[PDB]
Amino acid sequence: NYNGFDEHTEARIQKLARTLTAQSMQDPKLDPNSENFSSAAWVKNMAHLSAADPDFYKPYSLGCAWKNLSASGASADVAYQSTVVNIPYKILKSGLRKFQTNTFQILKPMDGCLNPGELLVVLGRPGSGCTTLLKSISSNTHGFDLGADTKISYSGYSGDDIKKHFRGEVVYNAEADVHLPHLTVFETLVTVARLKTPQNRIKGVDRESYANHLAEVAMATYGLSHTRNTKVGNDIVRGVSGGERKRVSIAEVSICGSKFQCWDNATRGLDSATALEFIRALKTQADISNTSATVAIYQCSQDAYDLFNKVCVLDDGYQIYYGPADKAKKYFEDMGYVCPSRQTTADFLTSVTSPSERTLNKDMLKKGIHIPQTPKEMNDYWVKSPNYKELMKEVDQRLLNPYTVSYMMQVKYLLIRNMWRLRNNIGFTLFMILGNCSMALILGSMFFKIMKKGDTSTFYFRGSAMFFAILFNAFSSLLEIFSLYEARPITEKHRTYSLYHPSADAFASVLSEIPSKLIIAVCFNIIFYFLVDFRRNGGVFFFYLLINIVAVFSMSHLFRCVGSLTKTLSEAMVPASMLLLALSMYTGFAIPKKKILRWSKWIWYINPLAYLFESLLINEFHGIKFPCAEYVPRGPAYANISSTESVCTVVGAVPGQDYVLGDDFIRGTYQYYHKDKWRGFGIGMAYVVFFFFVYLFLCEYNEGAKQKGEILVFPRSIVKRMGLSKSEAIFHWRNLCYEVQIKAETRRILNNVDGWVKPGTLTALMGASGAGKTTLLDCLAERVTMGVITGDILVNGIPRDKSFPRSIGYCQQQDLHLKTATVRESLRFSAYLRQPAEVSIEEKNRYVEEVIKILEMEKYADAVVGVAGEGLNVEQRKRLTIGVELTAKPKLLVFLDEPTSGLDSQTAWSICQLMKKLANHGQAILCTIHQPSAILMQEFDRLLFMQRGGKTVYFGDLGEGCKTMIDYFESHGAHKCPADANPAEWMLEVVGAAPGSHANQDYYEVWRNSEEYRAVQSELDWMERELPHEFSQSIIYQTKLVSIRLFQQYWRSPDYLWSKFILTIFNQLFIGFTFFKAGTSLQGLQNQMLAVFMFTVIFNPILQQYLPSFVQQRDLYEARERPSRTFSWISFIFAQIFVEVPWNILAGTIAYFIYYYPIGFYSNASAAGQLHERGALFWLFSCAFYVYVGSMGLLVISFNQVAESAANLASLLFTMSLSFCGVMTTPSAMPRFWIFMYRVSPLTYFIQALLAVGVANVDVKCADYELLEFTPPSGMTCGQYMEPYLQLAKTGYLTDENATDTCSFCQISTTNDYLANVNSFYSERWRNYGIFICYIAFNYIAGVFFYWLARVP
């Protein structure tokens, strides 16, 4: 707990000062080693000496003073919802509107002043202009225009002046907790301290020592010393508590020396005590650093409100009161309103703007005095009031009258921060190193055998192995983008106040990866170059390693540039995928430099991997003579021969040689010359430097964040034009208990709890944070699974049956709804599945209308749920959550879990009024409540109060003004409740659960021996004696509804489907037109094989695009639809399959149409008289491949919790299948060990059948450079000479059978014989299609089974 400079922090800071001065040694008000030393004086001295630099003309304090302040923004006229068939027109129309308006007055003219050292609380309802005010007075007016008449003076500096120079002296913080999760608090603060040390003006203490001291003083000042070595953490990574996480942000901004601050949503997610601690830390900062801060907060506690000097009250953008906080209540009570005795002043000030909550002073109405009731009237009254006159006197007088450390020091400190990040998340990096090591091991094992012999038979495999090496080194840096994106928001924060250049952060990020990149390169290349058995000369190996280093750095920088240009990784997925495809395909192995068409030769020329692969091949092949493997004239008939009458069967061969000079081979096949060896290094370094500079430039300037108004979406079909059943049984539980084995052997969470809820009564379930409130709801609702429950939970005196979980309604704290659905659609979806089967759908529609009317959401019934930022706000989402359960016609109860938590006071009161209205209708509502205000407590009929450990302390009708509860407690020793104390908080103090932990006695035992307890027992006995199909719809109907909703999600998810289809179109079109009519040359055939190979590499991105949709569906299901018994997991998974398949089939059809024909497989099929059959079968394979990618995505996500891990697993399996599919290395060339992997991978059968269909049953046309030349023996034509050989190796054709001086030979006559070498056959095509479909079926079935295992309980 934090108490804002109690003597403990003073002693801690005195110890720190003694340590600093003693370390240096190795006026009496300030000498730590003496008496009279004052810790406040010490911190104040440091804060002054931080801003006392002779070169700095910054102020010692800033205080804003504005008048006429008015802001406005372009009206956000509600716009229709984006859908796959509508987003193109939407983009076109938006582009036209930008190519070629009304306004909304966000804030009407306001005035105010805030001297240094003061704290201002801005009070207003949501949408009242609080955030806009904080952005205006902090000069963050991006997204809206500021009035032409506004005047803002920061103690003399115009807002323009602080924007130009002193930015960071005025700081606006939307959320406090934006931190690197994996740094400890001390590291997070020491990096900031280092970046702020005035590097020229410290003597006697080393700069690291001073930075450490300043970080420790910041921690002690804000009560964080106990978290020195704790990880800062996150909502998903364990670390310091939320309050400590926000006080870390306060300490950080304190170190950075901002003199003016704003905190828009400071206390979001904090309970009363923790929010008070945060405000107290802010007050301590104001006292010490003399900063002025402004906080916009809801549910402001009276204790917290006591700390603010000034208050600002808004409603509809009008200012109603500005001035001292303690005068606000009296000012409004003079206005004509009255504060209920127990109402905290902040709630009074905020409610005075809410007509259904205010209370007009009846006396002042009898006098006929007008009491303003609408915001304009209140603002006019304030303008008239003497408070405004006095405020303007103060304002008018005040309107009458870049980085601390050099660039390289910023780089150094940010690099150290990055290394700390790595050494705290080191597990990921270790798995990362091991992944590359293992992939190198596997690939090298795959090439080990064939490469070993070294004959000319290994040329294609040398090419393929070097292609793998260059790819797996160049792209082994791409998973640093995760860290890049994670760091970007904190870089933006640290830019909002001048701490370092964003270029310094980018440069630190680049330099921090060098260790990992070098280690990966060394390990991978050492393992690979040895297994693959490239040249063992040391110099060539080191040149190879150098080229790989240049490749990895080049790609790292190129894709950092892309990452910098996108909001998230998902948005970069598409262009990054295009870049990967272009670079990998045009590296010079898939299609040699000779065969690249004129339309895309420039791609080779600008591709760095092309030049680097050139250098690698020149290095590998240059100057080495590979002994010839096999000759054309061959066999016993050719035992005796002259050397020149034979030739080696490879490109660079010359007749009569026993070897082929690898340089000749590469010159013939790729046209790389030894003179170009060092071109690769030069171009690679040129690219590396250029893209490094462009990365710095982009990170320096292209960033920002813009404000936009909350909007409702109202799908286009709407924009074209634009009775609740009573509870019937009494639910009572007796002697309830619950134990779980997790934290301790037989640990009780509930202890003999008992009670009941009757129809038409709203029951409050209260307790401290924890205390088994939600646990009691989960047990009563039979929503809990683990542990053992004991005791009675009876309905109408009878044990709850198997229909009970359906008969009740349970509104969870988290309002989770399918974002793409609409409010009306969501309610109708809930009604259809859960209401009794025999109810006609028109009646379900009418009941949904009744429910919509009751919740008074009719004005936005058609809106899209969306998300927090766009769509329904918190109140609307809560109302939708309640409606969804009301539409299930819960026969028995309605369980609510903290409906009023996370809301403001006025929205909370609105929700409580809705709950009481429902109870009046007849509903039996049991709802957990947290820190309710005394006014809300007047709504609940009964109160079940539970002490820590699930130990009931009270259960009774709290009656009027909580008098019954107060009386029960006071009669039993509790100290009298003050007439102005909140009964909820007071009772929480009586039992000792609230801080100040001590109780006059164990009140659990007082209850157990109370008279109320025996009365409850008698009533429970009478309830015991008053006693006189797991799913509603069948599985087929549930599947129908769920699949329809999932379709409506794909539709209306234009980003996903358009990314999928544009990626398909671009990738496959690029493949098809890179190999445009490749022809049937010997190289053309393997080029087409590699084209079919590249057709498959689209797998990863289109799987990763799909996974988020499944995760979005699955979260909603498992979190609300499953416990509610809305539908069975069977329907969920069948919908996931049935909806994903059709879109994959459509994408496959598009891919076929744009790939099969451009590349020319159609002409090959036509030449064979098989156009229709082969075209149809290729279309079937494309559709099957896309369906298979979908099925693999489903399989991997069926048990992986997060999408990233599922994507990684799918990528690894696809990599194995692709590597061992038998084209990068033929099956007979693999080690006998890997034949299982070759046989099992689906891509063997896919690729073999696809290539067979593409190029089977036609003739080969060997180009000039491919023909084999040799001289026929004396006195016989080549026609006669080659006949003996030609009859045994029964294929091949001489270009001239009657030549006698020399003849050219083609060793493949027809493409079928070539395909036989690749092991692909035409007669197998249909069997392969069947096998591939079997793979899809197994993927889907295994996915279903693994979802059943992993996820179903």
Ligand SMILES: CCNc1cc2oc3c/c(=[NH+]/CC)c(C)cc-3c(-c3ccccc3C(=O)OCC)c2cc1C
């Ligand atoms: C848009 C970028 N696309 C991708 C880039 C990737 O780069 C990777 C770089 C790596 N090096 C460290 C940074 C490591 C270890 C794995 C990587 C994977 C990967 C992860 C798991 C299994 C296989 C692979 C994989 O295929 O890796 C091929 C290099 C990976 C995956 C995708 C989709």
Ligand SMILES: Nc1ncnc2c1ncn2[C@@H]1O[C@H](COP(=O)(O)OP(=O)(O)OP(=O)(O)O)[C@@H](O)[C@H]1O
């Ligand atoms: N360009 C714009 N920028 C900001 N708000 C706008 C704009 N156009 C219209 N508005 C509307 O003006 C109102 C201003 O309220 P604002 O959000 O600033 O205060 P608030 O809602 O109390 O702040 P917070 O959202 O942090 O609680 C909002 O309802 C918003 O929808």
Ligand SMILES: Nc1ncnc2c1ncn2[C@@H]1O[C@H](COP(=O)(O)OP(=O)(O)O)[C@@H](O)[C@H]1O
């Ligand atoms: N592993 C666990 N899983 C679920 N609940 C647990 C576990 N360990 C302890 N608990 C119990 O969960 C309770 C916290 O939930 P609860 O108090 O119902 O939430 P809330 O107070 O927000 O309604 C604690 O009382 C604690 O005894």
